[PDB]
Design a protein around this ligand. Structure first.
Ligand SMILES: *C(C[NH3+])CCC(=O)O
Ligand SMILES: *C(C[NH3+])CCC(=O)O
Ligand SMILES: *C(C[NH3+])CCC(=O)O
Ligand SMILES: *C(C[NH3+])CCC(=O)O
Ligand SMILES: [Zn+2]
Ligand SMILES: [Zn+2]
Ligand SMILES: [Zn+2]
Lengths: 341, 341, 146, 341
């Protein structure tokens, strides 16, 4: 009948034997080129012009639109658990705010700058990052200033963005993160900070490789940033554009970025590895975007994976691929989990 | 009052201007270093020893355990839509099959070899890949033969695996895909095919970088491959082990792999990029595993993403990262979609 | 008999000691002898003893001779008898020899490497970070440095 | 009972055998990629505006603050033992010297320029290097000119530094060594030497990688350069900043450095190796700083190490790491020791 056949084998070659390096729990930690720590985390905040706001963004599980009067009580526990950094997005809902050139983006009475002043006053040790763009402030929902045919106007757009970024830094932001993907905007932002005598204390964290695709969903609600007039494929990178992403990384580093962000993260880990070579002397940041985070939550409550397990697997994923910073909506969860681990 | 500030800007530098390369639909195709085609797809089949089986694997949406009498009617439409390759997994349910050394893995009456004979007879132009391992055939559910303390026995395990692989090739498999991750098994499998005069017609497709983690869920059901006695962390690579993965890629190529598989895929795209350098002269394959595929389905029916959109985004992801082959449960969907695209 | 090291018996003896520690329950062996080829034999011994799959070989692949070992010799009563350890400890200027020793021990089965001493040899750690980029690199802060 | 076990061994592999290259005293010299010679040494001098000064700097064993009338008798034996180079630091103690913009840094009556004129007259074959900075000449003790909030003013600072450096070269310095670490100062210094027709005979030796930390102690006394208003962490590099150091090396070479200094030395040898690649076509200099040198002396008189032995070990360390020049307070000792060795 049928029995187990065993082939005649040669002595073991040393070259074959990898197992001595990962047979114990502590070893699978020795095997990581970087470990996750609390100060690596950056938590997004969506700031309302309604100062009493604390509204659920139904598309973005466990995250709300908060106003300045409710921020202190929100951030206090977070800071106590070790949160070191926030990335501000403003969501101004008061009618008549939005205009073709994003005027309210750097309105001193606006949610972002008020947010910056609040946080500097009440949490002076908190590192403040501001998203720099016009899409939450424009009428058409696009990231820049447009010509009449609805295409982006590079020159006015970047001239406007430089202004907004410097104005955030003037207000007290420690770092500006331009998310517009419009050609050459980092040069102009850097030049504006230099002219304003702020380049020596403002970190330019460029979304240098921000891709177009199906993972932005939950955010647009969180920011009411739904476009008007077509899609953002003419400046967001196309998912297959590795070459364009490599050139964008090189470009933004040349134009003054102190750091770079790759967005989305899990679906673009190879681009993070690319970045780890091109921008080896710069901090690389992963942005765990709303669709990725929401995907994890859905699969979890469907029983496909465990939330905390897949959270650690994916965020360890970022560090493996070369990131040393992480923008994530699971930051509250990790400030808890990292005490145990 | 507050008006839009525009900073004084310099003339545009040519170095800044990337947009001329991706302003049109056809360009975002010109920008891909590889495009998805039908012959890149590899579809898994789970073959039952019940020849009348066509049972839903509830954890793996739209995929079933099929028996040989139902295979012809299943594969016929698939081949007609262009399917060129299958990867066989056997799921023997007849009691008393499973034994400590995986005896039934290469049982000529078993689902795999019967599957191989059926497919060679009825679909002679179909390229047949067989998963090579012992976990579906053992009592303890582990991928190899174990010592008494329950650790893996490298020597007997690899001696057994070499045998199974050669026996599949003797039966008519065109390609063997060892998924065991046990040190040096590719050398012995290659040596066995050479001794059996089959090395010249058998492709060795090594799971050279197969990682441990939370994404295997739905499969274990599909294959009834749930472990017994602890976890597979002592041979599956640990999620952070980039160094170990790089060494495993080099090793399996040195030991005779004609191609390599990275598994899982989306959560490990950086490893695919790593592989694209180390194994630049070899075909690289992505395995879209049951948990990843099930995650896409869940998020989709939750409204987070669109199924076909995120399917193309992720599978384009594999090609961008350097894969030129794709094992995926969405192969039926893509044989349809690629006609349009 | 002339007091030089005997490579063959030395390494045959070391392989034995290392495997015996692993047999006793050590998770990792760290050979600090710097005698040519000892990692191959230790690896081969663990393989023959069926322990290579659970024993990490952490080689002192770049251990240098010099003035920083002082306090240890007391701690271990390891003061030499018959000359110095310059014929196997690497000479402080031997960057080339250190690079070759790193490559060699990785080829012979090290799962990890140690550079010793540490602060005075940081450039060798950087060297190691390239040669042994896929392996854990360990610094030993030795008794004289501390 | 317990006897010595010897395992069965294989024949020796040639690949294992390194020992044939270092079994003799002469070989451990053949093994060095560079040997220490006398002309590699650079000796610091701290020049007093009291011309009769010869005051012990208690924190810096065996080194004094000397005035011009005592310099000839000090330098004469040194030159006779082979000293080829000095690096001048001025320590002006006459009250009312120090002012917010470092006015006295290039005072023709000041210790540095007087020192330059003395040495050119009395030791015309001596190569003169001058430290270029403002910290010994300012009221606040900082290395540059500051805005009102106490941060550094890049533009005036570098405009001032360029002036000081050119003025030293005008006085007769052969080399300028800017130690300020303020962004872009090498460009302006180079441009100033070019405009003054001195770029063709003035070596720019940039402290391109000068790190912040705990090793500067003994110097601050030697130079009375103790800060006022916080710390120098906003321009000195942070100890972990390898990326910033690599970029600073590239930058200063691009801006005109003919050579670079890494400071401190022993605790930063990996940065010297980094520099040996980035600046492979430039002389690399190690600065053995006051805290490192004082640490050697303390450990020595505590019996932990032997002074001459650890001196040769560390300074050989610099050459191994890629330096070919050494600024050190042990230069008197080595001019003696190198005759024997
Ligand atoms: C990106 C804004 N710049 C964030 C999108 C998201 O969903 O997280
Ligand atoms: C891997 C079997 N070798 C497949 C796991 C899955 O879920 O697809
Ligand atoms: C090395 C023993 N292998 C340790 C020496 C010391 O002083 O730490
Ligand atoms: C550096 C002055 N640029 C010297 C500091 C020391 O202590 O040697
Ligand atoms: Zn935008
Ligand atoms: Zn298996
Ligand atoms: Zn200074």
């Amino acid at each position: 009948m049928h029995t187990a056949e065993f082939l005649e084998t040669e002595p073991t070659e040393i070259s074959s034997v990898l197992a001595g390096g990962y047979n114990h729990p502590l070893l699978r930690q020795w095997q990581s080129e970087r470990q996750l720590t609390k100060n690596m985390l950056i938590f997004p905040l969506f700031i309302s012009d309604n100062p009493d706001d604390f509204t659920e963004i139904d598309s973005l599980p466990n995250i709300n639109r908060i106003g300045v009067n409710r921020l202190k009580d929100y951030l206090k526990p977070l800071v106590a658990k070790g949160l070191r950094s926030v990335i501000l997005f403003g969501v101004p809902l008061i009618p008549g705010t939005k205009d073709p050139v994003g005027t309210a983006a750097d309105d001193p009475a606006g949610p972002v700058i008020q947010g910056i002043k609040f946080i500097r006053e009440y949490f002076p040790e908190l590192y403040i990052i501001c998203d720099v763009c016009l899409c939450e402030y424009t009428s058409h929902g696009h990231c820049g200033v447009l010509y009449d045919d609805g295409t982006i106007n590079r020159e006015r757009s970047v001239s406007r963005l430089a202004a907004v970024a410097v104005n955030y830094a003037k207000a007290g932001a420690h770092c500006v993160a331009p998310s517009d993907m419009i050609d050459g905007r980092i040069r102009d932002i850097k030049r504006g900070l230099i002219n304003a005598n702020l380049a020596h204390k403002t970190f330019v964290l460029s979304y240098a490789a921000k891709f177009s695709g199906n993972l932005y969903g939950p955010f647009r609600d969180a920011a009411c940033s739904a476009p008007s007039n077509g899609d953002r494929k003419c400046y967001q990178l196309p998912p297959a554009g590795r070459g364009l992403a490599r050139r964008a990384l090189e470009r933004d580093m040349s134009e003054g970025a102190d750091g770079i962000i790759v967005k989305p993260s899990t679906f673009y880990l190879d681009i993070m590895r690319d970045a780890s070579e091109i921008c080896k002397d710069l901090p690389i940041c992963a942005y765990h975007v709303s669709g990725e985070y929401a995907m994890l939550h859905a699969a979890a409550e469907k029983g496909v994976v465990d939330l905390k397990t897949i959270a650690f697997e994916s965020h360890q994923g970022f560090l493996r691929a070369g990131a040393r910073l992480i923008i994530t909506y699971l930051a509250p969860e990790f400030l808890d989990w990292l005490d145990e681990e």
